[PDB]
């Protein structure tokens, strides 16, 4: 029922340039009833909440955490989404395989959850290994997705997940159209957002992988901002003429 569904990652997209973050929240703060806000971050819910306290993030309507593997409504965790992602998902099997790659090191336990298996790629290892991993996991027949971002972060998620799928799920839930949705991202864990039919904005300080993606799949709904961080979101809002 609002004119805009604003979805954005936090670190180096919403957050990173304090001044830009502040004037972005000032502008939006003056028309808070005209849009739904959702943070689509790779961080866990607790880690996101912690960031909010550090930089003073404005309270969002929804939290799409751990790359969309968990969705938090004002009232709490979405159990429908969780059961949905649990169908045919085989965490143990996938983990056993991923654990077998010398080039991969598990991320801390606090970065893992039932629907997210994360690792770090060795800075000395050849990225092509990510391809070998993807192929090997897909062939198990388990609906799995491999998310590679910032040249080091690797997330194993159900196929039904990722920021984009969580976004579409949210859009349906709020009866918001893609034409009324704006996704903002900076890295490979945002590609899912741009595979969506919503309007999208790639921040100026975007990671190499996202830019490469844009070069190959960029469409007319995708905008490459001149501004970096929060500024790109204001720039995009003016570009797609949202909150007219
Ligand atoms: O999906 C990529 C990656 O995202 C999250 O990582 C954050 C990290 O917690 C931050 O402190 C900062 O460094 O930026 C990262 C990129 O957003 C997840 O926490 C991580 O597990 C995941 O792989
Ligand atoms: Mg990102």
Sheet holding 153-158, edge to edge: 104-106, 117-121, 153-158, 144-149
CA 243 to chain centre: 23
- In angstroms, the CA 65 to CA 137 distance is 23
- In angstroms, the CA 138 to CA 151 distance is 21
By what technique were these coordinates determined? X-ray
Beta strands 62-65 and 70-73 are antiparallel
- Sequential DSSP letters for 159-196: TT-SHHHHHHHHHHHHT--GGGEEEEE-SGGGHHHHTS
Which CATH architecture does the domain made up of 89-159 adopt?
Alpha-Beta Complex (3.90)
Sheet holding 70-73, edge to edge: 76-77, 70-73, 62-65, 35-40, 4-8, 181-185, 199-202, 222-224
What 8-state DSSP symbol labels residue 34?
G
Give 152 Cα–ligand 1 centroid separation in angstroms: 10
Count of Cβ atoms closer than 10 Å to residue 94 Cβ: 20
Nearest ligand 1 atom, CA 10: 17
Minimal CA–CA distance to 232: which of 38, 70, 16?
16
Domain with CATH 3.40.50.1000 in the chain: 1-88+160-244
CB-based contact 5:38 (threshold 8 Å): yes
The answer to whether the annotation marks 9 as part of a ligand binding site is yes
Structure tokens given for 63: 């939290």
CA 18 to chain centre: 20
CB-based contact 29:22 (threshold 8 Å): no
Beta strands 104-106 and 222-224 are unpaired
Indicate the CATH number for domain 1-88+160-244: 3.40.50.1000
Minimal CA–CA distance to 195: which of 172, 175, 178?
178
The answer to whether the annotation marks 190 as part of a ligand binding site is yes
Domain with CATH 3.90.1070.10 in the chain: 89-159
Minimal CA–CA distance to 170: which of 26, 36, 33, 15?
36
- In angstroms, the CA 80 to CA 182 distance is 24
């Amino acid at each position: 029922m609002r004119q805009l569904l604003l979805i954005s990652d936090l670190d180096n997209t919403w957050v990173g340039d304090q001044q830009a973050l502040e004037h972005l929240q000032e502008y939006l703060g003056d028309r808070r009833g005209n849009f739904y806000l959702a943070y689509a971050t790779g961080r866990s819910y607790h880690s996101a909440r912690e960031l909010q306290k550090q930089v003073g993030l404005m309270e969002p309507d929804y939290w799409l955490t751990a790359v969309g593997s968990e969705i938090y409504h004002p009232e709490g965790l979405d159990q429908h989404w969780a059961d949905y992602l649990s169908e045919h998902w085989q965490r143990d099997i996938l983990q056993a395989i991923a654990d077998g790659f010398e080039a991969l090191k598990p991320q801390s336990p606090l970065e893992q959850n039932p629907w997210k298996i994360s690792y770090h790629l060795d800075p000395q290892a050849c990225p092509t290994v990510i391809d070998q991993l993807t192929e090997m996991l897909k062939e198990t027949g388990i609906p799995v997705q491999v998310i590679f971002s910032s040249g080091k972060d690797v997330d194993l998620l159900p196929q039904r997940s990722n920021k984009g799928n969580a976004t579409q799920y949210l859009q349906q839930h709020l009866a918001m159209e893609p034409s009324q949705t704006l996704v903002c991202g900076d890295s490979g864990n945002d590609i899912g957002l741009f595979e969506t039919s919503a309007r999208g904005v790639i921040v100026r300080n975007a990671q190499p992988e996202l830019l490469h993606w844009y070069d190959q799949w960029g469409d007319s709904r995708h905008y490459r901002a001149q501004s970096s961080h929060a500024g790109a979101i204001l720039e995009a809002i003016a570009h797609f003429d949202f909150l007219s």
